[PDB]
Amino acid sequence: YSPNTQQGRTSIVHLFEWRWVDIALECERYLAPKGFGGVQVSPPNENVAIYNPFRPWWERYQPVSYKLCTRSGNEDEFRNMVTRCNNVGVRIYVDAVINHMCGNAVSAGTSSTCGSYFNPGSRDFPAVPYSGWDFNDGKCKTGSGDIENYNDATQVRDCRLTGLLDLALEKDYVRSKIAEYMNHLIDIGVAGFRLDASKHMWPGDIKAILDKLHNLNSNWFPAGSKPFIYQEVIDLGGEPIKSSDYFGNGRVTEFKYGAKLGTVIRKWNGEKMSYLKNWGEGWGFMPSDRALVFVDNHDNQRGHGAGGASILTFWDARLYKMAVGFMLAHPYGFTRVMSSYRWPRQFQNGNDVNDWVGPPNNNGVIKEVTINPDTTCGNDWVCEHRWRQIRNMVIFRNVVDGQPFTNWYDNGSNQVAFGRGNRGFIVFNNDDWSFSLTLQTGLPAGTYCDVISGDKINGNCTGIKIYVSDDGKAHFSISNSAEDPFIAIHAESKL
Ligand SMILES: OC[C@H]1O[C@H](O[C@H]2[C@H](O)[C@@H](O)[C@@H](O[C@H]3[C@H](O)[C@@H](O)[C@@H](O[C@H]4[C@H](O)[C@@H](O)[C@H](O)O[C@@H]4CO)O[C@@H]3CO)O[C@@H]2CO)[C@H](O)[C@@H](O)[C@@H]1O
Ligand SMILES: OC[C@H]1O[C@H](O[C@H]2[C@H](O)[C@@H](O)[C@H](O[C@H]3[C@H](O)[C@@H](O)[C@H](O)O[C@@H]3CO)O[C@@H]2CO)[C@H](O)[C@@H](O)[C@@H]1O
Ligand SMILES: OC[C@H]1O[C@H](O)[C@H](O)[C@@H](O)[C@@H]1O
Ligand SMILES: *C(=O)[C@@H]1CCC(=O)N1
Ligand SMILES: [Ca+2]
Ligand SMILES: [Cl-]
Incomplete structure (x- = not known):
């Protein structure tokens, strides 16, 4: 439940789709001196290279293997980043995609970030390796094999989330391969993990996987340090699966937080800031010591997941700074700050048809994060964490800690x-x-x-x-x- 951040550092920043070399530099030249506690990196494991649309951000949520080889960099660069960041007191948290592999309809071949071969149709991922009996095909009971109803807690856990090949997390072998990957990351020096799609995994299977994890690298963390765990569970009420069902494994993403804040700040639905005086559990939120809060995340800032129209983003800069400001100043939960990249948001009817667009790139190669003389970023990296109003509130939270x-x-x-x-x-x-x-x-x-x-x-x-x-x-x-x-x-x- 502990961040394992350096004493006095109270926030982590999501450097969404940033390269390992840029994060390494950012830790040294900026995050450390500005008092940031750590960085949530995009999945570091090999994923499917999707060409249509062209290299969308979401291809990183379709694992091919556990080799640390992605558009963000290879294992050498990954290890380099973690070491350089730990050396200046800035932690690294990994976005662990362990609930599934790739889309079941993706073509077989070597269209992966490290060239590993995989065959979704035959449930074949030799680079791990995983085969057919390592997936929930026989366990799922829906007609489509996919999740069709969130009111049925069982299919949510045993069927395919939008067709993603669902791993059989009940098997000790699968649990072991996953733990092997995670321990590799832990021994390298990572302080914790964002458990992707946790709602889709049985809390008991997650627990089983965590049982096999090592203690944090003893060169940087005190002996007996348990890795920080925050599970992504979208629970706005109305469903059988509750965030509390995962408290045994660690903290949980509190999606009610940003949804509420967003509508208060926009002054929608008859709400106003004066109502915020009992902010926190007074509003139906989970316990403060289990909550991982944020105004927006990589999904809802672009209409994915569960955000709704009230979510505030860098697109609504003025109200966004206020919202992030309120969060960073309020004692409730552990705060995560979003750092995004700009994309050609184009709304058609109710939807952004460019919500798929990946990070700035030159034919697939992610552009480096350039720093302008006024300390803002170029190449379309928004760098909300460098906005004075946000950066100074991050330090504010450190200063008033406790x-x-x-x-x-x-x-x-x-x-x-x-x-x-x-x-x-x-x-x-x-x-x-x-x-x-x-x-x-x-x-x-x-x-x-x-x-x-x-x-x-x-x-x-x-x-x-x-x-x-x-x-x-x-x-x-x-x-x-x-x-x-x-x-x-x-x-x-x-x-
Ligand atoms: O050897 C050639 C094959 O190599 C790879 O096969 C691997 C499997 O894909 C992977 O699942 C794992 O296999 C283990 C099972 O996952 C695990 O449950 C257990 O399997 C039991 C099985 O449940 C039981 O019914 C059976 O009769 O006995 C098994 C134990 O022998 O252990 C499995 C073996 O460790 O590891 C496999 C070997 O690396 C490739 O994926 C496959 O395509 C190749 O043909
Ligand atoms: O509480 C007693 C009843 O429990 C049983 O229902 C079980 C299912 O049988 C079981 O499959 C499911 O739990 C498992 C997933 O199915 C599993 O693959 C994975 O390893 O993790 C889950 C829990 O960690 O949970 C329900 C509820 O316990 C049993 O079927 C009934 O007969 C019992 O009366
Ligand atoms: O690029 C940095 C700038 O981005 C946005 O314009 C913010 O509203 C502004 O406060 C910030 O300084
Ligand atoms: C909290 O994040 C970690 C995992 C649960 C625990 O005891 N420490
Ligand atoms: Ca699942
Ligand atoms: Cl999240």
Whole structure:
């Protein structure tokens, strides 16, 4: 349940589709000094090379083998990345796709990221190796062999998720091959795993697989360290399978979080920020110590999975920064920040027909992440983690770590504020009029740099300044027209 991040680091960033060499560099030049706790990488195992559409992002969720050979790099580069990141105190979490192999209708051949041969029709994946009796063909009871009804917990676990060849996780052999892959990653130095499609696996089979895992690499982690486990389970209520069914194995993705936040911030369905004062379990969310929270993830930012129209993304930058800001400032759950790439989003009727488009590339070769002089990224990498408003809130969360949610204020609409003990205070204005009031910050007297509009550098603030009096009060003024209608100050942004 523990992140195993370096003491004082409270967030991980999803460097979606980034190359191992770019992540290695990013850890050293940026994540370490900016206090990021770790990085969730895209599946590092060999996958199907899909040509139609052309190299979609989702081809990485169709395993061919467990060789660490993908468009992100080979094993040497993978090991290089993990070592360089651990050496500067930044952890690596692997997106483990262990519920299945490839689409059952994909053509046989060597169209894979490492050239391994595979035959879906004959359930043949010699590079692992897996054969027909390593899949749930005989176990699934649906007419199509695919998952057709989510109200039936059994088919959800024994049948094919959109046709993906379902592994027989009950078999000790399959469990062992998977554990072999995971231990390979653990011994290399990875601190944990995002268990992909966990809802589709029996909690008892997952447990069995974890039983075979090693302790974390003792060169970097203390003896007896168990790998961090967060299972992807989309549970918005209404279905028989509940997130709580996986608490025994580790943490669980809380998809209700971003869905709710998104509609509050958009002020949809009669909601407003003032309702957020009992945010967390007060809203029906799982226990804070089991929740892996986020505003958006790689699936719902592009209409996949379960997001809905309220999900906020870099596309809605202004409201997105506010949402991520609120999350990072609130004590509930363990926070994951999304880092995406841009694609030609083109809505037709209700759907983005370019939701398949993979990462920036030149004929299949992923483009490197260029860093512009102003520290933003080029080559279409959005790099939300480098946006000042988000990067500074990541540090904000580190600074107030452990402090209690306190000093809440609200105007009964969309102008709220709250503090974290005596270490941080944040103010939001999401009403269509000006927010100007003197508030109790619970902070020691002094001059603080607003970390949203600017930074603190060698004695001065580059943005807005807030003055806290001897009684902890400070005046705040946020126009409903402000570029970023929220302000944040903390112990370490103080002059
Ligand atoms: O030897 C040539 C073949 O090599 C590869 O075969 C591998 C299988 O694909 C893979 O599943 C695994 O096989 C083990 C079974 O998964 C495991 O359940 C058990 O099998 C039992 C079986 O359940 C039982 O009914 C049977 O009668 O006895 C088995 C034990 O002998 O152990 C299996 C063997 O370890 O490993 C296989 C060998 O690597 C290729 O996939 C295949 O195409 C080749 O023909
Ligand atoms: O609780 C008693 C009843 O349990 C049994 O129902 C079982 C199914 O038989 C069993 O297959 C299923 O659990 C397994 C998956 O089927 C399996 O392949 C995999 O290894 O993990 C699952 C659990 O880890 O679960 C149901 C419910 O327990 C049994 O069939 C009934 O007769 C018993 O009365
Ligand atoms: O590229 C970085 C920039 O991206 C978006 O425009 C954000 O809204 C802005 O705050 C950020 O500085
Ligand atoms: C938590 O993420 C890990 C897996 C469960 C445990 O004890 N540690
Ligand atoms: Ca399954
Ligand atoms: Cl996820």
